[PDB]
Amino acid sequence: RFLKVKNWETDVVLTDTLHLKSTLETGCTEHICMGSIMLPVRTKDQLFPLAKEFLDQYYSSIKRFGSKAHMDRLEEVNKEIESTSTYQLKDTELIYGAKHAWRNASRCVGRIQWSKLQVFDARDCTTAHGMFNYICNHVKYATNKGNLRSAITIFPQRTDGKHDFRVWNSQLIRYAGYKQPDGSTLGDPANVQFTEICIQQGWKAPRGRFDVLPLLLQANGNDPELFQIPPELVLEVPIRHPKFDWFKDLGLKWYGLPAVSNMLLEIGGLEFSACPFSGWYMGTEIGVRDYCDNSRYNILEEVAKKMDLDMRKTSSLWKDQALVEINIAVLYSFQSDKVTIVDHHSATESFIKHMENEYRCRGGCPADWVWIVPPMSGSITPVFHQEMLNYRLTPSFEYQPDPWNTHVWKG
Amino acid sequence: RFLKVKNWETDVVLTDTLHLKSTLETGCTEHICMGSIMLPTKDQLFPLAKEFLDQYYSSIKRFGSKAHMDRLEEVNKEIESTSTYQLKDTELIYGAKHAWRNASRCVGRIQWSKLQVFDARDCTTAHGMFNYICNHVKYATNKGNLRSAITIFPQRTDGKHDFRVWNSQLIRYAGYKQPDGSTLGDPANVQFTEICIQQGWKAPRGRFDVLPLLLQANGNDPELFQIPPELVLEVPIRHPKFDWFKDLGLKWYGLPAVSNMLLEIGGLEFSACPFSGWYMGTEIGVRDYCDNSRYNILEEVAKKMDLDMRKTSSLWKDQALVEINIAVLYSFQSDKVTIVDHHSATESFIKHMENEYRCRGGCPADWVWIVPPMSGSITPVFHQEMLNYRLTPSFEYQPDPWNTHVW
Numbered sequence: 083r084f085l086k087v088k089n090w091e092t093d094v095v096l097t098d099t100l101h102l103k104s105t106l107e108t109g110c111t112e113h114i115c116m117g118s119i120m121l122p123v124r125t126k127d128q129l130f131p132l133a134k135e136f137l138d139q140y141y142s143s144i145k146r147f148g149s150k151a152h153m154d155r156l157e158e159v160n161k162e163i164e165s166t167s168t169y170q171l172k173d174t175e176l177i178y179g180a181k182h183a184w185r186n187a188s189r190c191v192g193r194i195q196w197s198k199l200q201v202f203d204a205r206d207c208t209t210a211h212g213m214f215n216y217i218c219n220h221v222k223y224a225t226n227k228g229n230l231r232s233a234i235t236i237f238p239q240r241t242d243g244k245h246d247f248r249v250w251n252s253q254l255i256r257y258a259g260y261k262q263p264d265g266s267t268l269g270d271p272a273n274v275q276f277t278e279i280c281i282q283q284g285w286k287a288p289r290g291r292f293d294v295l296p297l298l299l300q301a302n303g304n305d306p307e308l309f310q311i312p313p314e315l316v317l318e319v320p321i322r323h324p325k326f327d328w329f330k331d332l333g334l335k336w337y338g339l340p341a342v343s344n345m346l347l348e349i350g351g352l353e354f355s356a357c358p359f360s361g362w363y364m365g366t367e368i369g370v371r372d373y374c375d376n377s378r379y380n381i382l383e384e385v386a387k388k389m390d391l392d393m394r395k396t397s398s399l400w401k402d403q404a405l406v407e408i409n410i411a412v413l414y415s416f417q418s419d420k421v422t423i424v425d426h427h428s429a430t431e432s433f434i435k436h437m438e439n440e441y442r443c444r445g446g447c448p449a450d451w452v453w454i455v456p457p458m459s460g461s462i463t464p465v466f467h468q469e470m471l472n473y474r475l476t477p478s479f480e481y482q483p484d485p486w487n488t489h490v491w492k493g
Numbered sequence: 494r495f496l497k498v499k500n501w502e503t504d505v506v507l508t509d510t511l512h513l514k515s516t517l518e519t520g521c522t523e524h525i526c527m528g529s530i531m532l533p534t535k536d537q538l539f540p541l542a543k544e545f546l547d548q549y550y551s552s553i554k555r556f557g558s559k560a561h562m563d564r565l566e567e568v569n570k571e572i573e574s575t576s577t578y579q580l581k582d583t584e585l586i587y588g589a590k591h592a593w594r595n596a597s598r599c600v601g602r603i604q605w606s607k608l609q610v611f612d613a614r615d616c617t618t619a620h621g622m623f624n625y626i627c628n629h630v631k632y633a634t635n636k637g638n639l640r641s642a643i644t645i646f647p648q649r650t651d652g653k654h655d656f657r658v659w660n661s662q663l664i665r666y667a668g669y670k671q672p673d674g675s676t677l678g679d680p681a682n683v684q685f686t687e688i689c690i691q692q693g694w695k696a697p698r699g700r701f702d703v704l705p706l707l708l709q710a711n712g713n714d715p716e717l718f719q720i721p722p723e724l725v726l727e728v729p730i731r732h733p734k735f736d737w738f739k740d741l742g743l744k745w746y747g748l749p750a751v752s753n754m755l756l757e758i759g760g761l762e763f764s765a766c767p768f769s770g771w772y773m774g775t776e777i778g779v780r781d782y783c784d785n786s787r788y789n790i791l792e793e794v795a796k797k798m799d800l801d802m803r804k805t806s807s808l809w810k811d812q813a814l815v816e817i818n819i820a821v822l823y824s825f826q827s828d829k830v831t832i833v834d835h836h837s838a839t840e841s842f843i844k845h846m847e848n849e850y851r852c853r854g855g856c857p858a859d860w861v862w863i864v865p866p867m868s869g870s871i872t873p874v875f876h877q878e879m880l881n882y883r884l885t886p887s888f889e890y891q892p893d894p895w896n897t898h899v900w
C-alpha cells in the first residue's frame with residue numbers, strides 16, 4: 083500500500099511505502115489520535131525474529147542479502163541465542179544500528195546528518211569509573227573546541243534486567259536546580275529532583291544559578307557513583323546581544339554540547355540502556371525552551387523590563403518581542419565564540435530536503451510534526467506546511483523510566 | 494479505555510472518558526499516526542437520529558421520559574415514511590452549538606454556548622440565500638462588536654438539490670495571476686476569482702477586492718451577488734510605532750466566516766451553513782500576511798525596518814513577524830473591532846478544557862491546529878497534551894462545489 087503526504091506551501095506530494103516495515107505501536111487507534119501525548123528481560127522466543135529482521139536489513143544495506151556471509155551470520159546468531167539466550171553484535175552491526183536509530187528518530191529535526199556519527203563502542207566497560215572515563219572522552223571528542231562532532235557512546239547491553247548500565251543524568255551536561263524554603267528556585271527548575279539525589283549521594287553543591295551537575299553513573303546494576311566532569315572539558319558560552327549592551331548583565335550562559343543520556347537504544351532485539359549521544363544545538367532549544375519556558379529559567383519578564391516594552395496587556399506582544407531578542411542573542415553568542423549552532427530556519431529547510439531525499443531513496447521518513455515544528459515562528463518555517471507520517475522503525479531510541487524510580491539499592 | 498492528559502507546565506492531569514462515545518474514524522492506526530494530515534439510507538439514518546435525540550434529551554434532564562420516547566417514536570415513524578426527518582428548532586439550536594463544541598481544531602470554543610442560530614431552512618432560491626447571508630453578516634458584525642452566528646440552509650435530500658455557498662469564506666479578497674507571472678491580491682483565491690469572472694463578475698483587478706458571493710440553491714447553477722460594501726467592515730493596518738507601516742497599504746476584514754463546511758446533526762446533512770466569530774490576531778498577521786503562498790509580505794516589511802537580511806540567523810523574518818502582528822492587533826483595537834491575541838485565546842482554551850473535563854469528561858482537541866503559528870511554546874496550549882477524536886454533531890470539510898457540480 084501507498085500513503086501520500088502533501089506540502090501545502092509547494093503542492094509537492096510524496097508517497098510513503100516505508101510505513102509497511104512498521105512494527106511498534108503508535109498509541110493511536112482509528113478512534114483516537116495520541117499524536118500530542120508525550121509518552122504514548124526478553125525471551126529467546128521473541129528474540130530470534132527481531133535478530134533476523136535486523137540482520138536481513140543490515141545485509142541488504144551492504145548488498146549481501148542472501149550471501150553465504152548473511153546465512154552464516156544468521157546461523158551463528160541463532161545458535162548463540164539458543165545457547166546463551168542472547169547474542170553479541172559485530173562492530174559493523176553496532177555502527178549501522180546506532181546510525182539507523184538516529185535515522186529512524188521521528189522527533190529529530192537534525193536527521194540530514196544521520197550518516198556522520200562517531201560511534202564509541204564501550205561494551206568492554208565494567209565499572210562506573212570505567213563509564214566516567216568513556217564519557218569524558220566522548221565529551222572531549224564531541225566538543226572538539228567548539229567545532230562540534232556528533233557522537234554516541236554504547237555501554238554493555240541489558241542481560242537479565244538486574245545488571246543494567248545506566249547514566250542517571252538525563253543529559254551529560256546540565257545545570258543544578260535548588261528549591262528554596264520560600265518556594266523560589268535557583269538555577270534550572272527542571273533539574274531540582276536530580277540535583278537533590280546528587281546532594282544526597284554526597285555532591286558538594288556550589289548553589290549558584292549555573293552549576294554543571296556531576297555525572298551519576300551505574301554499571302552492571304550496582305548503585306550509581308558520582309563524578310565531576312573536568313571543568314576544562316565543559317565548553318560554555320556567555321550570552322550577549324549584538325545591539326543591547328545590557329543583555330550581558332543578565333548573567334546568562336549556556337553549555338555548547340547537547341547530549342541525551344537517558345534513552346534506550348534497541349538494535350536487533352538487544353537493549354542498550356546507557357547510550358549517551360550528542361550533536362549540536364538548534365538555537366531555539368536554548369532561547370525558546372530553556373530560557374523562556376515558565377517552568378525553566380523563565381527570563382521573559384526581566385528581558386522585556388530592560389527593553390522597556392509595554393507589559394501591561396498581553397496584546398502588546400511583549401513576550402513575543404522579548405522572545406525574538408533572546409534568540410538573536412543565543413545565536414549571536416555561539417557564532418561569535420565559534421561554537422556550532424543552527425538557527426531554526428536553516429535546520430527546518432535542511433530537514434525538508436533530507437525528508438524528500440529519504441522518500442526517494444528509502445520510500446519514507448517517519449516524522450513527528452508536533453516535535454519537528456520549532457517552538458517559535460512555527461508557520462514561517464517550511465516544516466509547518468509539511469504533512470508528515472509518524473510510525474516506528476527499529477533500530478530505535480526509546481524513552482525509559484528514570485532509574486531512581488526502579489533501582490534496587492545495594493547500600 | 495480511561496485516558497489521561499498531562500499538562501507539562503503545570504503537572505495538571507485530566508482523565509478523558511468522553512472519547513468512548515467517539516463515533517467517526519481518525520485516519521490513525523496503531524501503526525501510523527496521521528495527526529498532521531489536513532484531510533485524513535433509511536437503515537443508516539435511524540441509529541444516527543436516535544444517538545442524537547438520546548443526548549439531546551439527556552442534556553435537558555429528560556432522558557427516558559415519555560416526551561423523549563414520544564419523539565424517538567415520531568422521528569422513527571417519519572423516517573420510515575419519508576426517508577428523512579425534520580429537526581425541531583430546539584434540536585437544531587442544540588446541534589449547531591454542539592457541532593462547534595465538538596470542533597477539535599477550534600481554539601475559541603470557550604464561546605460555544607453563545608451562538609446565534611439563524612434557521613434558514615425555509616429558503617428556496619439564491620436571492621433568498623443572499624438575503625439571509627447579508628442579515629447574518631450585519632448581525633454578526635454589529636458595528637465592530639462581533640457576535641458569533643450560524644445560518645443553516647435546507648438539509649441534503651437526494652443529494653441532487655444541495656444548497657452550497659461556493660465561497661470558502663463569506664468575505665475574502667480576489668486573486669489574479671499576472672502577465673508579469675506574479676500574483677495580484679490573495680493567491681489562495683485565484684481559482685475562485687476566475688470562476689467568478691467566468692460566471693460574469695466584473696472584477697476591478699485590485700489587491701483587496703471583496704469577492705462576490707456565489708450561491709447555489711436547491712442544486713441549481715450558482716448566481717453572483719455583491720455584499721453591500723457598507724456591510725463589509727474592513728480595518729486599515731497601521732503600527733503604533735512605525736509611521737511608515739500605513740504606506741504598505743494593508744487592510745483586512747473584521748468578520749471571519751467559514752462558509753464551505755458541512756454540518757451534520759442526527760444524521761442530517763446541512764451542506765450550506767456559513768458561520769462566523771471573531772479573529773485571533775495571528776490568523777491575519779502570521780498566516781494571511783506572511784505565508785509564502787499568501788500575501789507574503791515579510792521581505793518588504795523587513796526592508797522597511799532595515800534589518801540584516803543577509804543571513805537567516807539574524808532572525809529578521811522573526812523580527813518583522815512580531816511587528817506585523819502587533820500592527821494587526823493595534824489597528825483592530827483602535828478601530829474598536831473585536832480581535833483576540835494568541836496569548837489570551839490559548840489561555841481561554843486551557844480554562845475551557847478544564848471546564849469540559851470537569852463537566853463533560855473530556856474535550857476533543859487537535860494540537861496541530863490549536864497551537865498558534867507563532868510563539869507556540871510561550872502559550873500554555875503548547876504544553877498541554879490533547880486527545881483528538883470525532884464527536885457528532887460535527888462540522889466536516891467538503892469538496893469544493895465546482896468539482897462536484899454539473900452545469
Ligand code: HEM
Nearest residue numbers: 184187189190191192195232233359360361362363364479
Ligand atoms: C547534529 C545536530 C542535531 C540537531 C540540530 C538536532 C536537533 C534536535 C531537536 C531540535 C530535537 C527536539 C529537542 C527538544 O525539543 O528537546 C531533537 C530530538 C531528538 N534527537 Fe536530534 N539533533 C541533532 C543530533 C542528534 C543525534 C546525534 C541523535 C542520536 C544519535 C539525535 C536523536 C534525537 C532523539 C532520539 C530525539 C528525541 C529526544 C526525546 O524524545 O527526548 N539527535 N534533535
Ligand code: HEM
Nearest residue numbers: 593596598599600601604641642768769770771772773888
Ligand atoms: C468566537 C471567536 C472564535 C475564535 C477566536 C475562533 C478561533 C479559531 C481558530 C484560531 C481556528 C483555526 C483556523 C485557522 O487557523 O485557519 C478555528 C478553526 C475552526 N473553528 Fe473556531 N473560532 C471562533 C468562532 C467559531 C465559531 C462560531 C465556529 C462554529 C460555529 C467555529 C468552528 C471552527 C471550525 C469548524 C474550525 C476548523 C475550520 C477548518 O477546519 O477549516 N469557530 N477557529
Ligand SMILES: Cc1cc(N)nc(CCCCCO[C@H]2CNC[C@H]2Cc2cc(C)cc(N)n2)c1
Nearest residue numbers: 120121340341342359360361362363364367481
Ligand atoms: C543529540 C541532540 C541534539 C540536539 N540539538 N538536541 C538534543 C536535546 C534533546 C532533548 C533533551 C530535552 O528533552 C526534555 C525536555 N522535554 C522533554 C524531555 C525529553 C523527553 C521527555 C519525555 C517525557 C519523553 C521523551 N521522549 N523525551 C539532543
Ligand SMILES: Cc1cc(N)nc(CCCCCO[C@H]2CNC[C@H]2Cc2cc(C)cc(N)n2)c1
Nearest residue numbers: 531532749750751768769770771772773776890
Ligand atoms: C468562525 C471562525 C473564527 C475564526 N477566528 N477563524 C475562522 C477561520 C478558519 C478557517 C479559514 C482558513 O482555513 C483555510 C486556510 N487553511 C486551511 C483552510 C481550511 C481548510 C482546508 C482544508 C484542506 C481542510 C480543512 N479542514 N480546512 C473561522
Ligand SMILES: C[C@H](O)[C@H](O)[C@H]1CNc2nc(N)[nH]c(=O)c2N1
Nearest residue numbers: 118119120452453875876877878
Ligand atoms: C504536550 C506536547 O506534546 C509537548 O508539550 C511537546 C510539544 N512539542 C515538543 N517539541 C519538541 N521539540 N520538544 C518538546 O519537548 C515538545 N513538547
Ligand SMILES: C[C@H](O)[C@H](O)[C@H]1CNc2nc(N)[nH]c(=O)c2N1
Nearest residue numbers: 466467468469529530531861862
Ligand atoms: C500540514 C499541517 O497539518 C498544516 O500545515 C496545518 C498545521 N497547523 C495548522 N493550524 C491552524 N490553526 N491552521 C492551519 O491551517 C494549519 N495548517
Ligand SMILES: [Zn+2]
Nearest residue numbers: 110115521526
Ligand atoms: Zn494519530
